[PDB]
Amino acid sequence: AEQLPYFLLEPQDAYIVKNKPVELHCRAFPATQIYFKCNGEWVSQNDHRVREVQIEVSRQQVEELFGLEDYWCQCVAWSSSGTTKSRRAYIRIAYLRKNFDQEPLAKEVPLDHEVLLQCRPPEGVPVAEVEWLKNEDVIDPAQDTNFLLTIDHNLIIRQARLSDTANYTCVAKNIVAKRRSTTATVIVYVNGGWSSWAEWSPCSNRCGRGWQKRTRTCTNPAPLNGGAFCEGQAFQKTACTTVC
Ligand SMILES: *[C@@H]1O[C@H](CO[C@@H]2O[C@@H](C)[C@@H](O)[C@@H](O)[C@@H]2O)[C@@H](O[C@@H]2O[C@H](CO)[C@@H](O)[C@H](O)[C@H]2NC(C)=O)[C@H](O)[C@H]1NC(C)=O
Ligand SMILES: *[C@H]1O[C@H](CO)[C@@H](O)[C@H](O)[C@@H]1O
Ligand SMILES: *[C@H]1O[C@H](CO)[C@@H](O)[C@H](O)[C@@H]1O
Ligand SMILES: [Cl-]
Ligand SMILES: [Cl-]
Ligand SMILES: [Cl-]
Ligand SMILES: [Cl-]
Ligand SMILES: [Cl-]
Ligand SMILES: [Cl-]
Ligand SMILES: [Cl-]
Ligand SMILES: [Cl-]
Ligand SMILES: [Cl-]
Ligand SMILES: [Cl-]
Ligand SMILES: [Cl-]
Ligand SMILES: [Cl-]
Ligand SMILES: [Cl-]
Incomplete structure (x- = not known):
């Protein structure tokens, strides 16, 4: 003892x-x-x-x-x-359940738009650590400062660059397994803009009644990732009169 x-x-x-x-x-x-x-x-x-x-x-x-x-x-x-x-x-x-409650959906967006990708991961024990993939590569909000991870495991693209045109995937992991959501395609379009009208062609008659032409082009910018064509006239032609 x-x-x-x-x-x-x-x-x-x-x-x-x-x-x-x-x-x-x-x-x-x-x-x-x-x-x-x-x-x-x-x-x-x-x-x-x-x-x-x-x-x-x-x-x-x-x-x-x-x-x-x-x-x-x-x-x-x-x-x-x-x-x-x-x-x-x-x-x-x-355990890590098989099915996501919520998966992200595909989007079209204009340049400079805020994008919100929804993800509700399967339930796990231990609790599931959630990531996002951009075309495989793991996003990381510290470095890639145009991205936010919500505490609800959602992804925010703050304002959409054109390189943000990609395949996005929610991943959930723990010691049991990893699970990938359905991959959502995000496409960032640019709509067309007109150039300036070129200068009027010279009046076809230097003194008297004639005609002249001018044009512009869907190039400012050209439309992109299936953005809109420009709307209105590309070409004009009217009568002119110079006097002598
Ligand atoms: C989004 O999806 C498709 C298919 O995905 C990947 O393709 C490889 C690059 C590979 O690394 C895997 O991750 C996937 O399989 C992308 O691939 C091409 O584009 C079209 C889309 O219409 C697809 O159907 C063709 O099979 C692919 N062609 C070739 C020659 O690869 C697609 O490009 C992705 N979209 C974006 C916006 O990046
Ligand atoms: C060209 O035409 C008009 C502007 O004059 C608008 O519809 C738009 O700006 C387009 O690029
Ligand atoms: C061409 O037409 C007029 C100027 O003549 C404007 O509405 C604009 O400059 C456009 O490019
Ligand atoms: Cl002891
Ligand atoms: Cl012993
Ligand atoms: Cl006991
Ligand atoms: Cl026993
Ligand atoms: Cl189980
Ligand atoms: Cl499993
Ligand atoms: Cl979504
Ligand atoms: Cl970024
Ligand atoms: Cl851009
Ligand atoms: Cl032990
Ligand atoms: Cl797995
Ligand atoms: Cl999976
Ligand atoms: Cl646009």
């Missing part, structure tokens, strides 16, 4: 990923015995001085537990004089 066991090593919290079991390890000294209690029941290594012990916990054990309360294991060590108890280690079922 001198001491009480000290845990050199304690069972650590852990996740069931798919149907793969979890090992818990614990080691203490000094100890005449050491053993796992899960949810108040003793459990031996079978289908479940310094001394150590290990166990496995299985998907089935965690599912079949009565109650909403997290499954837990702790170790108990024995000396000549008493017991010590390890921390409680929590084993949780990890």
Whole structure:
């Protein structure tokens, strides 16, 4: 009756990923015995001085537990004089649901428009870290300062450059898996603008009644990514009169 066991090593919290079991390890000294209690029941290594012990916990054990309360294991060590108890280690079922609640939709937009891409990722445990892809490459709001990630996992293109014409994809990840949304095509068009009217051609008669022409062109700018053609006359022709 001198001491009480000290845990050199304690069972650590852990996740069931798919149907793969979890090992818990614990080691203490000094100890005449050491053993796992899960949810108040003793459990031996079978289908479940310094001394150590290990166990496995299985998907089935965690599912079949009565109650909403997290499954837990702790170790108990024995000396000549008493017991010590390890921390409680929590084993949780990890998952990432298959379907996105909300995926982004394709858009046409004018140059300099604000674009909002909606994404509501599948639910996960652990909770799902959301990214966005621009033509594969991962966007990053720090560097790419024309982009904001909303706390709702949405993407904002602040004002649309023309290089922002791309395929955009919401990705959700955790330790279980990664899931890609439906890829949304964003297209940034420029509508056409007229040049200035060229100068009137000289009056076909230097003194008397004649005619002259002028023109302009859908080039200021030319339409782009299927923006609108210019609207109105490209060409004019009227009578003129110079006097002598
Ligand atoms: C958006 O989608 C299509 C297809 O996507 C990618 O193509 C490769 C570049 C590859 O890296 C994968 O990520 C995808 O498969 C893009 O590809 C071309 O364009 C047309 C679109 O009408 C497509 O249907 C053709 O198959 C593709 N042709 C060739 C020779 O690659 C498309 O360009 C993307 N849109 C934008 C705005 O970038
Ligand atoms: C050319 O025509 C008129 C301007 O005169 C507008 O419809 C538009 O600016 C277009 O580029
Ligand atoms: C051509 O026509 C008149 C000027 O003559 C303006 O409306 C504008 O300059 C356009 O390019
Ligand atoms: Cl201890
Ligand atoms: Cl452990
Ligand atoms: Cl207990
Ligand atoms: Cl047992
Ligand atoms: Cl041992
Ligand atoms: Cl599951
Ligand atoms: Cl899965
Ligand atoms: Cl959207
Ligand atoms: Cl940017
Ligand atoms: Cl641009
Ligand atoms: Cl995956
Ligand atoms: Cl997926
Ligand atoms: Cl435009």
